[PDB]
Write a protein that binds this ligand. Sequence first.
Ligand SMILES: N[C@@H](CC(=O)O)C(=O)O
Ligand SMILES: N[C@@H](CC(=O)O)C(=O)O
Lengths: 915, 915
Amino acid sequence: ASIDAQLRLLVPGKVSEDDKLIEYDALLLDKFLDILQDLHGEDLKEAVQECYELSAEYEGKHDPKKLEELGSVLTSLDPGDSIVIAKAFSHMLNLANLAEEVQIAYRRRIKLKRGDFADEANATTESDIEETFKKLVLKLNKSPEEVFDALKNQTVDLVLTAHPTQSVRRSLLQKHGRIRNCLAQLYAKDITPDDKQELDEALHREIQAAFRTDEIRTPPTPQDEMRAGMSYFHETIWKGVPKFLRRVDTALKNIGINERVPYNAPLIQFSSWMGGDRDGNPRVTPEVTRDVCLLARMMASNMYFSQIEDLMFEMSMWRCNSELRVRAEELYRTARQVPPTEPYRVILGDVRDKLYNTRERSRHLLAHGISDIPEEAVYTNVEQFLEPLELCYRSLCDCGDRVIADGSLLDFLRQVSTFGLSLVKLDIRQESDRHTDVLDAITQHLEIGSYREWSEEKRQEWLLAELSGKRPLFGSDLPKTEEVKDVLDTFNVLAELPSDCFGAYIISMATSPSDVLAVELLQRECHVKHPLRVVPLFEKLADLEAAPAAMARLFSIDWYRNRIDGKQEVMIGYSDSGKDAGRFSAAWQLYKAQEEIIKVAKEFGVKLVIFHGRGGTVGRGGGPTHLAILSQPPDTIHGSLRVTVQGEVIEQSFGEEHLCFRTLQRFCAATLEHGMNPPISPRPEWRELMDQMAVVATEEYRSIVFKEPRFVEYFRLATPELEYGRMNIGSRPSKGIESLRAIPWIFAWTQTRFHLPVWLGFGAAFKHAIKKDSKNLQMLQEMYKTWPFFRVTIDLVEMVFAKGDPGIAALNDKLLVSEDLWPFGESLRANYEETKDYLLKIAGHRDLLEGDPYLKQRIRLRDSYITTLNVCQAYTLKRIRDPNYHVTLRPHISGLEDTLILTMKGIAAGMQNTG
Amino acid sequence: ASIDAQLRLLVPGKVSEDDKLIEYDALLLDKFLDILQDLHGEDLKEAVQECYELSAEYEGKHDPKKLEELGSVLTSLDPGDSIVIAKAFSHMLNLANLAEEVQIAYRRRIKLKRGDFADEANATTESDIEETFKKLVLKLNKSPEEVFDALKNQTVDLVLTAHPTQSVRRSLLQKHGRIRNCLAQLYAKDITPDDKQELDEALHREIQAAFRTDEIRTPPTPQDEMRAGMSYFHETIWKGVPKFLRRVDTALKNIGINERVPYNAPLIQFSSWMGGDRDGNPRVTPEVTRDVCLLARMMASNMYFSQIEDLMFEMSMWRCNSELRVRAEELYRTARQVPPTEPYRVILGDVRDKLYNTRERSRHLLAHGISDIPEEAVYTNVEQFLEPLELCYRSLCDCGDRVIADGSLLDFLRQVSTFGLSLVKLDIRQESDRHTDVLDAITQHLEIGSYREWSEEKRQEWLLAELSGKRPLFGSDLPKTEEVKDVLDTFNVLAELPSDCFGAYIISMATSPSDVLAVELLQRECHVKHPLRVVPLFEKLADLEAAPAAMARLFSIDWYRNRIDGKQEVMIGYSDSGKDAGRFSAAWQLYKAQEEIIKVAKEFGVKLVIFHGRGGTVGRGGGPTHLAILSQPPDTIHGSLRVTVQGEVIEQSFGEEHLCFRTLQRFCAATLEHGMNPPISPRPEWRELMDQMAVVATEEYRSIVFKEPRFVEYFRLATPELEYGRMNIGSRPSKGIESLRAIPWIFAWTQTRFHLPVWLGFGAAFKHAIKKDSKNLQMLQEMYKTWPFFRVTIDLVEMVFAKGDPGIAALNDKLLVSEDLWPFGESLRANYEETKDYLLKIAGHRDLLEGDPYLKQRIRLRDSYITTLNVCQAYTLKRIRDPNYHVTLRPHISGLEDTLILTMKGIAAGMQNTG
Ligand SMILES: N[C@@H](CC(=O)O)C(=O)O
Ligand SMILES: N[C@@H](CC(=O)O)C(=O)O
């Protein structure tokens, strides 16, 4: 009641019977405090309470003295007390996030709505799959048969990637899951009062179990990181896929199509980078890739094996067609155990043994390299596994029992067909220099010169000479650095392993046609019988500008064209390009890049798939992902969406089963709509203005980030990037700021609540547009109201500002940055304010997130917890870095490195996605 | 809407937001009809509809022409159409029962209540475990510590037995389960509208799946029947036990006891007869018993194996006491796979392998008699399995994490401790003649005479001479009939198998102390190292009268007394005794028998457990079971309830998880209360009247059932007992009416809706009480209002009359019984009416079940469906029995033996428990 009133003082809540977020947080906190008291004593609970209040008062008034009050309580803790408190706030934050998931899961959809594109920006107002169908028939004049057709031919490929600050352990998500479920159920109307006393107890227990699953730090092998990343299949994706496909079927009945999506239409696919991306990451070896492909194969076949047992129980029926009868009797005769009066079980029992075999073979190969289990007794292609299930389906329909075939059996065909034999196909990624090195080692060995030195024309001439050559390039004889051996051994792994383990070979830092032709040649020479498609990733602005020419050249080369069989994937990386030119300029350039590359594809009759890498507005998750997809340039999806699911977004997207369902839904709805309903194309005046604004934006960003000689120094002091690197959480930080990687660049500035990488340059751009011609404000405002790409671009920056607090960034300056650099920090904070102000005026908003109060509330509630972690972090950095700084310790109330790891992860759990 | 209005015409429904039964039936029927139409054509659906209406109109007005209208539609069906219709009505009946389960599961408990013993007769008003605790502290002056103590020392042993008309297949219960769950959920307030379209579809599908799981008839091996009987463990009992124990814990916190029931207090146990009872059943061989003990061991260890995997996921914690640390490091060193930083998982992984081993060993022995798996690598005693789990519990509590130990780990300790290594312990039962035969074979072989011929005194003298003898009785050399070999081989199975597989050896038709001493000797001579306790089952009235003397003698014999170690179980069988003297007389005799046997036990200082066999008021299930227990004679439970769970009641008791929980609850609540709050003891006037009424009751019943020379003839014509026997559904029917077994006797008369065995004799008794002295009516009425035993006895008979329809029994006469026997049937129907009338006047009721409208409604709703099956059955019996009877067939609209099997099972599914 006091806990609830202090929260409601912080948030002016709402009457909606939906809105219980604050109640959820009160309850969770109250239980958590009780637990703290039981485990660590009243005084420790009191201290946690004291710190929380101080944070609350700060998020209220923003009096900066409150940060120093909190500081003086935090700096006065022996390191054992400091760990327990940083762990409390970390856990309260996670709890807050779980409460949010429950709130979003059960919030009521809004019945009356305008049916304009703004509705698509929020879960509560966005279109579901039936609404999208109906919209397409009614407002775009499509026959249902046409909508059905588009949908059958559509793919959405979600690509899973490493969590930047380490993935949650599988057992911790299950606990989280149980906390959510207890929370949901304590407010259910369907369960009575005494059933609930036990839920209170179950919830209290589960909050404690999660708290005491807290071992710390050798951060984990890439194999271990991959396993943890794959957790969401068991948690929600495995059931969610069939569940969502069944909804599609209902939407279809409701617009007059009586059929179901064929079970083998590949509407949904998952891919993975985990153990495949080695770009600037030498822990990801050849052996690691070999491993994760075996683990994928193992996990998958373990899931099918376990599920088929349930299916077998259900399939008790005795009526079959003669085709199944024949097959059953054969298998029964090999009488090596069910009755023949249960024919479906005879077939499925045989499939079960193959699955078990497929699973042991994989485990053996992982543990030893050898299996006594022969490939003949195992599944090596997904069609071998589908065939007998197709036979069951047919047999049931033939006997008049389609309605039964359409239950669990149909769910299973869809699972098999969506997940295939692994659950995910692995992309490989490596940077083009590393290919050039391999090729230079070869040219020097052959005594024909230095490939590195050759011009792009000469490279091409030679690479095409070898790709039509009749003669192998090199052997094992070849003298290799370690790095060159690593690239070759990777290709050997691709040659040994089956082609259903893989998808794309992504070339980082791609710039030329030779970049792609080099990988094609290496694949062929390493004897990859079925080469992975090669996908260039264009990173720098200059690189995006030349991309279209590069693709024109590739497509005009007979060998490549033939090889590519009318399909090409190109990858873009928003964070990467933004690190080179600033976010605004990169946003515009990538809109144009996509138009231009699509144009070139059309001209050569090549189907082009744009693979969205991290940092884009489609990575946000939730409603915003819906409008983001709808806002893609015309024809840039054309039935194939490939998109990165950022690790810092996966829990929110897929952890809770309703949210998982809505994620799959919105990816399908928006893809289908876009291909038939592109957004409006910009007015010429808008394009002109965007070009002008980009030039200015880029000049601002670059002068600060690359031309200010003391910038890197400032960045290393104000920011924990050096300590992120040295306590490496994941990869490793540089390969100056050109050299630093995207993820560390975003993470450094997110941790100080300043977020420079997201907003810098927007201010110069808007300021200059408006001084040049006051009318530009109105145009900028009109662009916001009517151009989806622009709306969505501003919305993401607005959201990032909501997560911003220049107070916190000033505290880091004060504590960590030398006095000579303070005016620099201060000018950067002046830039923040100005940039924000312009963003607000363009959006027509007085405060941040006025258009999105549900998001506003969520963020404001987390901020109490994050803020404590930020203060703790700031003063801990001061203690680690400065031996001259000492501060008197309280007597014990219930290892600075440990505290810092804890705060870095917490602030990352709290900030989730930004840029 | 038309379907719903025709149902509501049949039942004057109610406003309660609870009461949705009629809606549930409308929905289920509407879907079912759609399915029938899809599978068999509009005309077949129409015919089913036509028959249902006719039945409806009959249950409305009771115009007997409607039965013949239905007859003429049913007799005019080719046998393929007849099968499909009998199957429709069978399925509609099952559906009705599923709807009932959902209605009972979610009906609201009544808050305001008198707190007299009548409240305990209904689920809605009965006391839960907290109410019972509070009652005992408040109204009986017990300290909570005393109540806690009684409860720790209490056992309830539920003994599972064969379904009399064949157990439902395991896969069919799961389907049933899913129909219930879809039904519940379609009315949930917590799930929104679109989620529901899919439930409609899921329910329609599941009603169809159940319908097409319908293979017919070699009725099943006893092994197969046992497996099907054990289904309820997976379905609800496995989780229900821990769930109910946790409730007990909450009830305890709420009366001020801060502890939990120790995990190893044996509050709940299950036993089994399946594969153990061979009394008049030679399909139950030695080998069958060997088998079911192995299957029990296998199923159990399979469940523990699968559950421990979940537990292992949860037990991620790293803090342990040193005792667990030591053990973990040992196991890890035998490094033959988890990290040692996860000590609970190292311990539980080792337990998992033992469980897997325990499970393979059992399977091998079942399939071959030999296992390569040694007994050393397996669990052979439940304490070996508990010990490491106890170690986990302790370690968690020591480290401050009791709250975590009290979750899943505690659930698991309770499961292990409740179920032990098998899930159920097997009782053996055999009739005493068969022992006498064995002993006569021995005495003749030894050339000392004929044990059969010896007097009871001589038997005892000899059996005690051999039980103190120093010299074995016989070898393999012994000349044996097949029957005598079968008894010896059974005892050899008990000698070979471990003693945790077994419980009681029940002697059917027990009458003398030598009966029990004979089995003790046989056990010892067959080298059963740990002999099963021997339990006499007294069946005839005369036998119940001499029971107390028999037990006095046994207890006064030093050898037996020493052997028995202060514990003896005696079994009673209500149906059995009722077959000898009529229900009323048996009810009274067994009240007195129990008083007398308890008295004798007290005198000798022996703890006496009464084992309730079938047919008693405690077998009803639901609320009535609660009052039944409370009505036992004083001191006859004394902390140990052993009771039969009749197969025809198991689904209702345990199929749905709420009902399962309430079943366990009420057995605990009522047992605990009774031991501290016996019912009032009868007034002398009441005892006198009961004795007078019994003498008369017995004379009526016996003169009709045993002394009427044409009775057996009448019974064989009016009743399908001959066809129950010959199409044997289970056992086999006789060993005249003395010879016939209880179950067939009850089943024959239930099938004609006449139920003679339950009510015959009550009429003579009441009539005579009242003519003797008109005041006796008032006393009889007072007994009903204030003596629980009497209330409960009348209530069961009242319920049976609600299931009665003398119209149906008249139709069977008309069709099947020769005209010369019609006045006999008619006098029996006059007796029915008169008996009913008296029962109503005694109860203060104008109509049947006026005290229990919820039960009234349930029964009236089933009756529509049953009635069709009854008509179908009657005319099918006429066709099978009379080649001279032929009746013209409709052209086909979409095997008489098959139709009959179907109707017999349906009517049994519909009638459930009677006597
Ligand atoms: N993912 C949310 C922000 C957050 O939940 O942190 C959004 O992009 O709006
Ligand atoms: N078992 C119920 C009757 C029934 O459901 O058939 C009772 O004894 O009241």
